Ligand binder design. Structure first.
Ligand code: FES
Length: 98
């Protein structure tokens, strides 16, 4: 499957539509398609690449920084998140979390 992922940067008021394989991380696909996004460790261990879901689901089982309450609130570490549906996600959300 290949899922439609919509990246929303609220502070800048931008929207980008990308297509992400079910076996590729969202951040990697975004970059390949010309859309740079924040990151540092690329290993699910910091919050630099955090996003927040608007709709849809991800598999971010490789992540280790976010706690269960943050996951239930919709936060996602985009560097280790595979889409499992079409997704709409707000990017640049780390400031929510520090
Ligand atoms: S860049 Fe560190 S968790 Fe994603």
């Amino acid at each position: 499957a290949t899922f439609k992922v919509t990246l929303i940067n609220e502070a800048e008021g931008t929207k980008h539509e990308i297509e992400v394989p079910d076996d590729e991380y969202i951040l990697d696909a975004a970059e390949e398609q010309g859309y740079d996004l924040p990151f540092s460790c690329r290993a699910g261990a910091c919050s630099t690449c955090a996003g927040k879901l608007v709709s849809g689901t991800v598999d971010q089982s490789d992540q280790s920084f976010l706690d269960d309450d943050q996951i239930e609130a919709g936060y996602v570490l985009t560097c280790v998140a595979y889409p499992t549906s079409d997704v709409v996600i707000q990017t640049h959300k780390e400031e929510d979390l520090y």
